[PDB]
Each structure stands twice: as C-alpha cells, then as structure tokens.
Amino acid sequence: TSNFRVQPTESIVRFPNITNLCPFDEVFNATRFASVYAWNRKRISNCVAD
Amino acid sequence: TNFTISVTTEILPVSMTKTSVDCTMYICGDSTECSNLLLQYGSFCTQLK
Ligand SMILES: *[C@@H]1O[C@H](CO)[C@@H](O[C@@H]2O[C@H](CO)[C@@H](O)[C@H](O)[C@H]2NC(C)=O)[C@H](O)[C@H]1NC(C)=O
Ligand SMILES: *[C@@H]1O[C@H](CO)[C@@H](O)[C@H](O)[C@H]1NC(C)=O
Ligand SMILES: *[C@@H]1O[C@H](CO)[C@@H](O)[C@H](O)[C@H]1NC(C)=O
Numbered sequence: 001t002s003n004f005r006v007q008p009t010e011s012i013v014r015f016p017n018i019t020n021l022c023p024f025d026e027v028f029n030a031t032r033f034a035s036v037y038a039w040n041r042k043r044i045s046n047c048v049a050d
Numbered sequence: 051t052n053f054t055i056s057v058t059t060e061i062l063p064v065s066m067t068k069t070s071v072d073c074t075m076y077i078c079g080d081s082t083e084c085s086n087l088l089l090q091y092g093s094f095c096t097q098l099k
Contacts, residue, residue: 003072005080 022047073098 027042034040073095078084088095 003075005075 018046018048020047022050024050070099 022044074085074088
C-alpha cells in the first residue's frame, strides 16, 4: 500500500557566525559614485546580510 | 570401435533480485509540496509498483 516514514520533531540550525557587521552605508549612500564605462568593483566578504 | 564418456556443462539464468521502488520518496524525498504536485499527475508510480 504505502511506506512507513517518521516525522521530524524540532528544527536544528547551525550557520557560520561572521557577526562583524557589514558597512553597507559606504557602498549604498556613498558621496561619490563611479561611471558606467568605469564601474568600481569591491569584493565584499565576511560580514552580515542585514 | 571405441567410445568416450564426455561431460559438458551448460549454464542458464533463472531470475534476478526483485527490486521495489517508490516514487514519492526516491524521486524527491520527504517534501510535502512534491507529494502534492505528484498527486495531481495521476498514478504513474502506482502502475510502476
Ligand atoms: C578405448 O579407449 C580407452 C581410453 O579412452 C582405452 O582405455 C585405456 O586402456 C589402456 C590399456 O588397456 C590403459 O593403459 C589406459 O589407461 C586406458 N585409458 C584410460 C583413460 O583408462 C581402451 O583400451 C580402448 N579400447 C580398446 C578396445 O582399445
Ligand atoms: C558565534 O559566536 C558568537 C559569539 O562569538 C556566539 O554567541 C554564537 O553562539 C556563535 N554561533 C554558533 C556557535 O553557532
Ligand atoms: C545616507 O545613508 C545613511 C546610512 O545609515 C543614512 O543614515 C542617511 O539618512 C542617508 N542620508 C543622508 C543624507 O545622510
């Protein structure tokens, strides 16, 4: 007829805790912006997705 | 004028190992949305079983 399966009880979460804050203000509300032909590329890493 | 009692061997297969599979678990797993989507597709894996 069917198959016998079990059900989960609680959820377990484990994530890498890089809680060093992400300065998105200097990239979003920046005083100076680059042009289309020469766009500035910054490799943002090791921060939070706030 | 003479005879030889020779012995020959013949090998013939009979059957194999019986295999039974299920669609809702092997195709996707424990997802409820997959089962809901498969319920509207008919009874293909029922016919396979
Ligand atoms: C028919 O062939 C068999 C062998 O295939 C012969 O048996 C041999 O006989 C000699 C002498 O009697 C023995 O030294 C051998 O050891 C025997 N062979 C085996 C395998 O045992 C038999 O003699 C033959 N028959 C005739 C009438 O010649
Ligand atoms: C990450 O580190 C912080 C403090 O350093 C801690 O409170 C948190 O539990 C850690 N996250 C883990 C272990 O998953
Ligand atoms: C610029 O961005 C910052 C980011 O925190 C925000 O606080 C501020 O209101 C924005 N505008 C001005 C005019 O500074």
